[PDB]
Design a protein around this ligand. Structure first.
Ligand SMILES: Nc1ccn([C@@H]2O[C@H](COP(=O)(O)O)[C@@H](O)[C@H]2O)c(=O)n1
Length: 302
């Protein structure tokens, strides 16, 4: 009936960003199903420094990316034909980095010789070193070039259907991380057919209430980061800090959630959730995670 083409990727996925997401999207577009091998903390420490995020954090983050069908924990550092056969994958997909042994032989010679290796395009605008750099520091630093096409590639493109519960969440969603995934995952359980709209605050607003040099990622980068998450149906690309009556009617919102993090008051001292609270449609959800963008900055610099 086809047959199905099963695609393999592997990696560390330590500090996942929209570059990793875009690479996984590309890999999935080359077949029908995507399996991602993720290395253990130990295996990574053998080859380079130990990772910032624990293997179980990294596993969970990768599984939350909507193009990924399954995560294989404890994948070997280098892709082999044996691993591809074990998971019945036709080929693996990696970036175009030079990957040579000390001798000048390709790290992936085996897989490449068997014709089971594919390259995907490198993602413009981000890398893990760039993001580290931003964290060691509002007018914006990213050279990401957002386009209608990148949004189309990342967006599910679906409108709310009859029977679907529209649920609005809002925030910075900066350095979109496992705390956000845990939040969104719980929100997604609140209805049988959830349609989650994530409202992303403007860069200048985030800087105002989060301070310092925040946000690390600009509105356009955070747009792609949130759209990659399997729990998200739509994003408001520049949402007001106050959850307004206009927003609630425009999107026909059924429920509004916020996590157990602190809600900073609005410019005028008001509760930015006052309207949905008055309507009786506000629900606080405990994500069970204490991870914040501020604490990631701390784990990554230290
Ligand atoms: N660890 C975390 C981090 C964020 N969140 C929720 O995710 C949403 C977005 O958070 P930020 O604006 O801080 O990015 C908020 O509703 C916040 O309460 C959570 O519930 N648990």
């Amino acid at each position: 009936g086809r047959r199905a083409v099963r695609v393999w990727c592997d990696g560390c996925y330590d500090m996942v960003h929209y570059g990793h997401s875009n690479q996984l999207r590309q890999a999935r577009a080359m077949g029908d199903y995507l399996i991602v091998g993720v290395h253990t903390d130990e295996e990574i420490a053998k080859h380079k420094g130990p990772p910032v995020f624990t293997q179980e954090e990294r596993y969970k983050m990768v599984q939350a990316i909507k193009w990924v069908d399954e995560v294989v924990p404890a994948a070997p550092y280098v892709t082999t034909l044996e691993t591809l056969d074990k998971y019945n994958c036709d080929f693996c997909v990696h970036g175009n980095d030079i990957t040579l042994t000390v001798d000048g032989r390709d790290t992936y010679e085996e897989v490449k010789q068997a014709g089971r290796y594919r390259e995907c395009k490198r993602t413009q605008g981000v890398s893990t070193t760039d993001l580290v750099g931003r964290m060691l520091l509002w007018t914006g630093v990213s050279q990401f070039l957002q386009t209608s096409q990148k949004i189309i590639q990342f967006a599910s493109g679906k409108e709310p259907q009859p029977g679907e519960t529209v649920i609005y969440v809002a925030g910075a969603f900066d350095l979109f991380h496992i705390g956000h995934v845990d939040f969104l995952e719980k929100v997604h359980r609140l209805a049988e057919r959830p349609y989650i709209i994530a409202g992303l605050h403007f860069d200048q607003e985030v800087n105002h209430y989060k301070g310092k040099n925040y946000p690390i990622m600009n509105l356009h980068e955070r747009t792609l980061s949130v759209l990659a998450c399997r729990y998200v149906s739509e994003v408001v690309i520049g949402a007001p800090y106050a959850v307004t009556a206009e927003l609630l009617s425009h999107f026909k919102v059924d429920l509004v959630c916020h996590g157990k993090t602190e809600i900073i008051p609005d410019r005028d001292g008001s509760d930015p959730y006052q309207e949905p609270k008055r309507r009786g449609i506000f629900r606080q959800i405990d994500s069970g995670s204490n991870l914040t963008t501020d604490l990631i900055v701390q784990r990554i610099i230290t």
